[PDB]
Amino acid sequence: FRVNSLQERVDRLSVSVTQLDPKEEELSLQDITMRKAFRSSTIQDQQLFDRKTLPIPLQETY
Amino acid sequence: RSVLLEAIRKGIQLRKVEEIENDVATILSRRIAVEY
Amino acid sequence: LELTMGRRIQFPIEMSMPWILTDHILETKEASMMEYVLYSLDLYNDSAHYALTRFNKQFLYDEIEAEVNLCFDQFVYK
Amino acid sequence: GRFESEDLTSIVELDGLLEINRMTHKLLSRYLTLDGFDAMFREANHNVSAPYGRITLHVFWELNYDFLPNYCYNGSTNRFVRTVLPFSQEFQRDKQPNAQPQYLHGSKALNLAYSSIYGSYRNFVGPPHFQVICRLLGYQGIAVVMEELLKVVKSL
Hints:
Oligomer: part of a larger assembly
Structural class of chain A: mainly alpha
Distance between the termini of chain C: 30 Å
Order of helices and strands of chain C: HHHH
Strand content of chain A: under 5%
Radius of gyration of chain A: 22 Å
């Protein structure tokens, strides 16, 4: 699923980049003033041994 | 003097003011944030 | 536990051998022992398997799992 | 963040510290899969969804409030130095709370060592500073600074 979702995401970005025009691209200071800075994902996995993570086989033995 | 400066003055007034407690990592981070 | 006359429903992780042996390596960062640290952690598997197949008691596993859950987070952090 | 709380002369220390971070990234990348170093840097520099990073902006801020009004150029040595006391215009910067050594140079000893190393760059502004400024700003950073200096000169 993820692969397919990403592939189509990659494909249309490969097209968007094609349309990029350095000659017309204008820069504004409102990005530094009115628009938040890019933030990469900061997900950290924890509590890996909750009962809900217990595999079915062991659950039955339990 | 410049429009860029104001654009910076506001940037500082946003990363300063606009700046899970039962978490194992969190609890450990604070126990260390005191020794320093 | 029985000897505590109800004072203790359990013992904290600092009194738990598996964690005592495991945390000691993490705390001292001992280089000669760093490739051994997973083996001491594996002791929980032995105890878990024993609680499920020999003692046949659910609460014993609940407590082992709850201890591992806490200790493993500390393991990753340190 | 350290650079944003110091004057322009501290940019040499910033560059050295960044290079240590780049090395740390390389050493870690042998065993772990991390975001590209440049991607990490631009994000921290707020230079991903914005044209000018924090470094470039702080360089200009310092030029405007410190360098231009407080420094004296010596054409024989090709270095700038600070003016006399009565003409020194102070502007208070918000201090930066130091973190654990591993978030800087690695240890207390290393922090001291490098701190002293870069102390030889705090009492003047010359080619070494300009060299770093060029590298960190790039064409786009240098251009905007020049454009902004013109506005300052025109204003005066």
